[PDB]
Amino acid sequence: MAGFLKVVQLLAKYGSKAVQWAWANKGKILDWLNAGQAIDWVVSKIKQILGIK
């Protein structure tokens, strides 16, 4: 869970709703990281889902 919590910690700068989405989608995030997706790629993907631009 080291990559997952790095994702959540990087999202915390963006606020509670970003952290909220990450916890509810923990399995997606774990699956992306295990599929070879980088932590920074996952943070960007989540920001795109949230509409942070």
Residue numbers in the entry: 1 to 53
The authors write:
Tryptophan is frequently found on the surface of membrane-associated proteins that interact with the lipid membrane. Here, we describe the use of racemic protein crystallography to probe dedicated tryptophan interactions of a model tryptophan-rich bacteriocin aureocin A53 (AucA) by inclusion and/or exclusion of potential ligands. When proteins of natural L-chirality are introduced with their synthetic D-enantiomers, they can form centrosymmetric crystals in achiral space groups with high dimensionality, thereby enabling structures solved at a high resolution over wide-ranging conditions. Finally, in complementation to recent studies, this work illustrates racemic protein crystallography is an effective approach to elucidate tryptophan interactions of membrane-associating proteins.
